[PDB]
Amino acid sequence: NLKPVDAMQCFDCHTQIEDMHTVGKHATVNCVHCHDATEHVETASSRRMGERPVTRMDLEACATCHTAQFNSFVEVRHESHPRLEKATPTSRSPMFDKLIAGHGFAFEHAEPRSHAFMLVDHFVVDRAYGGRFQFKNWQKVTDGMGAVRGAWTVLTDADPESSDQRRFLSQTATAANPVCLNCKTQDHILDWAYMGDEHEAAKWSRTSEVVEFARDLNHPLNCFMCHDPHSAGPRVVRDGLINAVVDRGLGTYPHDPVKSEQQGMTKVTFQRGREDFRAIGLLDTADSNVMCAQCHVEYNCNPGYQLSDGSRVGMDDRRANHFFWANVFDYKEAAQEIDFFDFRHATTGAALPKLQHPEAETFWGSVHERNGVACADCHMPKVQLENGKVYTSHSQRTPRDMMGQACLNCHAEWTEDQALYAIDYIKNYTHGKIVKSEYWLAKMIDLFPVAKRAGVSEDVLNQARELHYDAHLYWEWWTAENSVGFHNPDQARESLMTSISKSKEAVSLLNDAIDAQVA
Amino acid sequence: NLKPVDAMQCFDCHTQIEDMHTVGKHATVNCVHCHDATEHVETASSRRMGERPVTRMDLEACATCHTAQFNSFVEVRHESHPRLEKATPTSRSPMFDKLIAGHGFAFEHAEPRSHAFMLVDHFVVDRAYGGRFQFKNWQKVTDGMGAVRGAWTVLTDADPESSDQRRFLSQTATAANPVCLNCKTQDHILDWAYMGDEHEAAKWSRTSEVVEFARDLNHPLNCFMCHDPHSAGPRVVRDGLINAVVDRGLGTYPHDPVK
Amino acid sequence: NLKPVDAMQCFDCHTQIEDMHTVGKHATVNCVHCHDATEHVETASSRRMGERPVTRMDLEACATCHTAQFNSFVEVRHESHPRLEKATPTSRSPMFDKLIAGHGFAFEHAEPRSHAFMLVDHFVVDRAYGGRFQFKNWQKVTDGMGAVRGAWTVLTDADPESSDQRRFLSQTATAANPVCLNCKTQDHILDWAYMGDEHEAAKWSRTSEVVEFARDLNHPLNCFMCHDPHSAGPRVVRDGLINAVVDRGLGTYPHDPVKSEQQGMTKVTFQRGREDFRAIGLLDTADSNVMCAQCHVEYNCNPGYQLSDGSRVGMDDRRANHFFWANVFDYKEAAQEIDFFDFRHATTGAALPKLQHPEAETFWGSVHERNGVACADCHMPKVQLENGKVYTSHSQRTPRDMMGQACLNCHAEWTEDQALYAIDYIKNYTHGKIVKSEYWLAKMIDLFPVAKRAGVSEDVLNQARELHYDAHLYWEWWTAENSVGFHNPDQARESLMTSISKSKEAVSLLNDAIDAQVA
Ligand code: HEC
Ligand code: HEC
Ligand code: HEC
Ligand code: HEC
Ligand code: HEC
Ligand code: HEC
Ligand code: HEC
Ligand code: HEC
Ligand code: HEC
Ligand code: HEC
Ligand code: HEC
Ligand code: HEC
Ligand code: HEC
Ligand code: HEC
Ligand SMILES: O=S([O-])[O-]
Ligand SMILES: O=S([O-])[O-]
Ligand SMILES: O=S([O-])[O-]
Ligand SMILES: O=S([O-])[O-]
Ligand SMILES: O=S([O-])[O-]
Ligand SMILES: O=S([O-])[O-]
Ligand SMILES: O=S([O-])[O-]
Ligand SMILES: [Ca+2]
Ligand SMILES: [Ca+2]
């Protein structure tokens, strides 16, 4: 059984914790729930840590007093089909392999499934660790509760004796690096300096051996990613997000200065040896738009190249951990501002961006966002009980499972079937334009080898490569983004029509040049 | 927001609470969750209460850290048919009126329904208070969460100016007395001496005016009826049961001395 | 009404029948249930048949005493979508037409449906008889009971006056031959010599006119294919299977000598004019793995060519009726051992194998097979009755229809939804790798005409053709095999990664050679 410690002892040295803990809704929650600091207190001085206290990062540390929220979070949605490859005719991107050739996602890119699995799925996907990690057997894929208890309770490592990234099966890649883990877990929150910069007090950084780092990590989506454990107040902890909102002064809502001021973020910094070490962003309000934007954004979390001179941009570079914080029509400018692209297309040779699930940036300026609706209203609504204490569902999933709470309370004019029909109208229309964008991109890509072999000039090929950048960006945003247009239907429409226009322009350019060589 | 108090200072006088609280699974749960003792601490000695501290008996005191248990308790089972008289051909006792004639249960004896309603149902049944108490209207019969928040949030008293047991409608009885309430609530746990015997320190006893007692009670089946709030360990609080098992030496299983 | 005959009369001449019938569970079942032998007994001698007795092969001969098993067998699973072409984007092999070009399956290859239809479906598929046979009208496609009563009760022949294989509609083929029928019916069990070799006593053989043979056949999947009618004991009757297990000494479990000895097969031969004529394989145990392996295997049942010199291998050759009895990683060696391939790819010119539903060979060495599980545990389980005599379901279908009996009795840790999710994880992952294997095969195939037209050498084209053999084998095994990886997920994964590797190797070889011609 837990025995309480005297927090006044701690507060003598930890004045920021004192100011947060004594004022918030955890003022009565004793430190012993999350820290074992007995030897620390015996050996610390006001400026030296002494013995390092143990800090619990397991979700069960919160589940004892908050069982309803924990249980709602860990539920597995079995209807969210698992390990389902997107590069198939029945999924999001039928022509993905041709369009993405040259990039590591060609090795595997599955649809998302329930949050319980995020860390294990990151470890086992074919593009990440060369197939080094597997579930202990194929039965363990069902075990959401086990994954939450810890990745290493359900996974195996093919070679515990080595720590290098290498292929263990032929059709795998080794794309994973330490930046990735910041959107899968924050078990490393006390061991990673802000942005992953080198730091004397940091065990792990952008340049660490990712296999060694992985072995130290266990829990998905820690509860404290959105809730300060000391004040219980709303926050973010993701470095890249704090960097965009606060350091670069872009604001929580870059298109709306007023909403940014009402619903802002305050950066709180913690030091080691009196040098800045790590930071959090305290939110003015419990704003799920910004909480979910810790991960559901377009980002760099990988090495790349410079647009200017084509030189390698390695993990050591700050740009390898970056939130662009830009909508699809501002993205090219944002990538130019850091002089960066992701890969060269294997067929066309074009410098190209790689887009990641940009839900937050897509949602900006949409009808729902403009009306003050937030991710949680549709994806984590309040539970409705005939007789009960209301709490917020933490099962972050499609509103199709809870249409009464997620849609119909606001849309009183609709039945469930009518609201579903409105969603499908948007998704069907947008998916049609995605498929057409892919048809035109593929037609363009396939002309590159024909043009090369016909002796078309490098100048013409480079003109087509510049068009490929835009044709790609204005398509891939929408196969990356998970709502199939629902979050912003007009923007999806405008972007996908632009993609098709760019590809058609490139097709015309190449066809004419090929024909001129033939004559 | 709650601010914790110095529990060690309490323990200078409260040695039984100290022994229970420091050892069990509520050792880290501060007294401020259930007690407002600021003036008490200022005025008490080990031999004098001073100002009486406030003690919370509402179930929400536990629901903050144990929402799953609270929500499962308060749920209303709509299939448990409400206000269903047992003395009918389709219920438990078709000839109950003839057989029970002379007893107060002849005025009304319904089948049980969900625990959330036990205190309000005790107050409104025709055999108990002469029909003095009613739900505010016939819609309120559904409101389990409201009854749990407190009986007087969902009930009305026909005559707040009098405190006597009498009939307000002809076919009612006044069978209720203070002993009844021990199986409906323990809001009176600090105001009732063991067995309801007369005691200088008891506001309420077996001989109190039950209408006055009723007005002072709010919550059904308090969570602490089965769980000690200090140790979190298993217990009972009902005097009559402790009297049978312990005082009269019958044991928890009178037919099995080993068990 | 049936009148019993004196079996002692028969036993004077039929001593093998005596030894089987008098000992087994049909010792009390009189010969008249299945034979009309009155004139036979009047005219036979100990070595000459005289008048041929009539033998019933209709399933109703068993249904009188075994109605439960019969009714469970004949049930139509309407959820098993009928006449569904696999070469479509929503089915098993979206790029099948490009990959299989040159082979008769390009004319039609539908998904399987319920066993009641196997003989009629064989007769009416577009690749088989040139469209000669049809159901009497499009309503008859529903009539499972009618198909079981007899194919010719529900089918019509476009030209009863001719017996040649020819096209009756333009986009059909005439792939059917007498070997095919051995996996659709055994009505011919007394009229076909072992392996279909020429024999004086055999009415039909590998070289027969298949249209004439077809007209003589009526019933699907006779009950006696797995149960000896005389002893009632477990057996197989399929010649190709007996040949692999017994004649070639490969064993019932080629990867496990011990299991092969515990669960073995005894070949029993019957003679005509004191010369070996036909055979059965009596099983040591009621082993559904080996019973279902009569048909659910990779096989030759067709003419082909020699790998060594490219010469035709006709129906007259023993190799036209062959069970390879080899897993995917042993198959190439098995085809080399008989010097055989199926077709030349229409685009690449590569010699290629054609793979057939290799469920039995895929199941070997899988986790379930290693734990002593058999096909019937998941596809024909015991019926569970609150009050009833237990029998074995004969409705051989997906375990999704009976998850309680097929999975959950063994997997107590799972709900039905969890077990379904585990199946889908495997099928989704494997199908993703199938689609990727097809993408790479298609990319390779499409380079052949480009290379040819650029003047690439025959030596390079032949190197690519050798790679095509392996790229094809390691892909097609999995579109042929019906579990979409479930029966052996690790093997599917290893094979499909090998396919992709081989195709990528060939793409690189051809691209480099084309580029060298251009420069
Ligand atoms: C002064 C003598 C201290 C006492 C009393 C307590 N802590 Fe401490 N702590 C102290 C220092 C100098 C440091 C290094 C960081 C800094 O602020 O200078 C720490 C660090 C921690 C940590 C972080 C550990 C990590 O892994 O990075 C924790 C969780 C922590 N301290 C907790 C803690 C508790 C619970 C205390 C009361 C029991 C406590 N500290 C007392 C200095 C001092
Ligand atoms: C019991 C000892 C608790 C532990 C362990 C955790 N929390 Fe808590 N939490 C607790 C209480 C008594 C309260 C106040 C309840 C009230 O409404 O009065 C809270 C509150 C929260 C909140 C809401 C805060 C707000 O300002 O609205 C959150 C978001 C919260 N708690 C989160 C949380 C986390 C993430 C925990 C694990 C690190 C955790 N709590 C543990 C009691 C206890
Ligand atoms: C936050 C900015 C992230 C970074 C850094 C990484 N990932 Fe991620 N990932 C993120 C989200 C919001 C999602 C779900 C939405 C979606 O579009 O899938 C994911 C999903 C995955 C998955 C599962 C789906 C799949 O692609 O198969 C995997 C396997 C995964 N992510 C791996 C991964 C790798 C290897 C990363 C570093 C190269 C990485 N993620 C970083 C958010 C973020
Ligand atoms: C990084 C730590 C994340 C935070 C914060 C949020 N999400 Fe997320 N989400 C993330 C990943 C890596 C995945 C894929 C997990 C996998 O194993 O594949 C997801 C997935 C989702 C989904 C799909 C769930 C399903 O049933 O398939 C949804 C609807 C979703 N995410 C929504 C969502 C919301 C609304 C968030 C703020 C409350 C949120 N996520 C935060 C990564 C992270
Ligand atoms: C960000 C992706 C979150 C994660 C990780 C966790 N919670 Fe959460 N929580 C989140 C939101 C948007 C809200 C609603 C805020 C509002 O006022 O609208 C909450 C709320 C809570 C509460 C408060 C009580 C309630 O409303 O239910 C608690 C106690 C709470 N959350 C606990 C909790 C636990 C235990 C978590 C890990 C399993 C957890 N939260 C993660 C957003 C996010
Ligand atoms: C948060 C500030 C709490 C308050 C308010 C209440 N309880 Fe509690 N309880 C709390 C914790 C942290 C624990 C330990 C959890 C663990 O398993 O480690 C408990 C435990 C209990 C138990 C279980 C006790 C045991 O198994 O020995 C019970 C029965 C219990 N709590 C009851 C309870 C009651 C009735 C409350 C209102 C008077 C109550 N708790 C309030 C945290 C908190
Ligand atoms: C609008 C046209 C109504 C219809 C249709 C139904 N109800 Fe009603 N009801 C309505 C009002 C305005 C009121 C009084 C509200 C108040 O708070 O003063 C009521 C009252 C009831 C009651 C209580 C009656 C009592 O004597 O105390 C009940 C039990 C009730 N309503 C139930 C009910 C049922 C079951 C209905 C469908 C048959 C129904 N109402 C329809 C308004 C309207
Ligand atoms: C000796 C005079 C016989 C008598 C008595 C019976 N049978 Fe016969 N049978 C006999 C011969 C020489 C043959 C040819 C095969 C052989 O073993 O040498 C047969 C064949 C059959 C068959 C197979 C018919 C076919 O189509 O191939 C059957 C089904 C059969 N016999 C049945 C049978 C029955 C039921 C008898 C008792 C009523 C019986 N036979 C008697 C020789 C002799
Ligand atoms: C009635 C005259 C029957 C005819 C016609 C068929 N079978 Fe039979 N069968 C019959 C009996 C009385 C029994 C024994 C029942 C018992 O359990 O004691 C059987 C048994 C079988 C078995 C089980 C054998 C075993 O060793 O376990 C099988 C597989 C079987 N029978 C198959 C079968 C076939 C395929 C039939 C048509 C050729 C057939 N039976 C006809 C009675 C009768
Ligand atoms: C046993 C070794 C077989 C041989 C010989 C033939 N077929 Fe077959 N066939 C077999 C099985 C186990 C299945 C079901 C599994 C599957 O993958 O489909 C089939 C299926 C068919 C079908 C229906 C499905 C389809 O392809 O449209 C047809 C029309 C069919 N088979 C025809 C056919 C022909 C023409 C054959 C000789 C060239 C032939 N089969 C032989 C098993 C076996
Ligand atoms: C040859 C005589 C076979 C034997 C012995 C077994 N199977 Fe079969 N199976 C065969 C064919 C030709 C077909 C396709 C029939 C058609 O008309 O398309 C099948 C089909 C199946 C299926 C699919 C059923 C569905 O609902 O779609 C299954 C699940 C199946 N077969 C399983 C199976 C089992 C487990 C067997 C041993 C008990 C078995 N089959 C034997 C051909 C033959
Ligand atoms: C009476 C008004 C009918 C309606 C309503 C439906 N059907 Fe029909 N159908 C009808 C007749 C008289 C016939 C020909 C019967 C014969 O044996 O001559 C049919 C035929 C069909 C067929 C076969 C078509 C073929 O081309 O061979 C099919 C597949 C069929 N019918 C199906 C069908 C469906 C699905 C209906 C509802 C949508 C339907 N029929 C209605 C008479 C009538
Ligand atoms: C192989 C593909 C089979 C076909 C064709 C038929 N049956 Fe079958 N049968 C098969 C198996 C795997 C089993 C279970 C054996 C075990 O002990 O596990 C059976 C069993 C029977 C029985 C025994 C009683 C029972 O378990 O139900 C009978 C009487 C039986 N089978 C009859 C029967 C009939 C009538 C068939 C044609 C419709 C038939 N079997 C075909 C495998 C196969
Ligand atoms: C007993 C007769 C079983 C039947 C029926 C089913 N399963 Fe099974 N399964 C069984 C065992 C003994 C094992 C190995 C257990 C271990 O931990 O060693 C399995 C394994 C699986 C697996 C994992 C396969 C892997 O390759 O790692 C899966 C995905 C699985 N089982 C699923 C499954 C399904 C869906 C079933 C019904 C169709 C099913 N099993 C039946 C034992 C038995
Ligand atoms: O209070 S923290 O800043 O040590
Ligand atoms: O914020 S900057 O990188 O445009
Ligand atoms: O790879 S993650 O960013 O989807
Ligand atoms: O500790 S109590 O008994 O005052
Ligand atoms: O008994 S059989 O061999 O004629
Ligand atoms: O059995 S042989 O053909 O390898
Ligand atoms: O053609 S049969 O072998 O599927
Ligand atoms: Ca990116
Ligand atoms: Ca073959």
Swiss-Prot record, chains A, C:
pH dependence: Optimum pH is 7-10 for nitrite reduction, and the optimum pH is 7 for sulfite reduction with only 20% residual activity at pH 7.8.
Pathway note: Nitrogen metabolism; nitrate reduction (assimilation)
Keyword Hydrolase in annotation: no
EC number: 1.7.2.2
GO cellular component term of the entry, any: outer membrane-bounded periplasmic space
Binding residues annotated for heme 1, in chain numbering: 10, 13-14, 40
Temperature optimum or stability note: Optimum temperature is 80 degrees Celsius.
Residues that, per the record, bind heme 6: 180, 183-184
Cross-link named 3'-(S-cysteinyl)-tyrosine (Tyr-Cys), sites: 299-301
Binding sites annotated in the UniProt record for heme 3: 26, 62, 65-66
Pfam families registered for this protein in UniProt: Cytochrom_C552
Record entry for activity regulation: Inhibited by azide and cyanide. Subject to competitive inhibition by sulfite.
Sites where the protein binds Ca(2+): 298-299, 354, 356
Gene3D superfamilies for the chain: 1.10.287.3080, Butyryl-CoA Dehydrogenase, subunit A, domain 3, Flavocytochrome C3, Chain A
KW Zinc (keyword) present: no
PTMs per UniProt: The thioether cross-link between Tyr-299 and Cys-301 may play a structural role in the active site cavity. Besides, it may lower the pKa of the Tyr hydroxyl group. An additional covalent bond between Tyr-299 and Gln-356 has been observed in some protein crystals, but this may be an artifact that is due to the formation of tyrosyl radicals when the protein is exposed to oxygen.
Keyword line: Calcium, Electron transport, Heme, Iron, Metal-binding, Oxidoreductase, Periplasm, Signal, Thioether bond, Transport
Molecular functions per Gene Ontology: calcium ion binding; heme binding; nitrite reductase (cytochrome, ammonia-forming) activity
Family per similarity comment: Belongs to the cytochrome c-552 family.
PANTHER family per record: CYTOCHROME C-552 (PTHR30633:SF0), CYTOCHROME C-552 RESPIRATORY NITRITE REDUCTASE (PTHR30633)
Subunit structure and binding partners: Homohexamer. Dimer of trimers.
Protein name according to UniProt: Cytochrome c-552
Organism: Thioalkalivibrio nitratireducens (strain DSM 14787 / UNIQEM 213 / ALEN2)
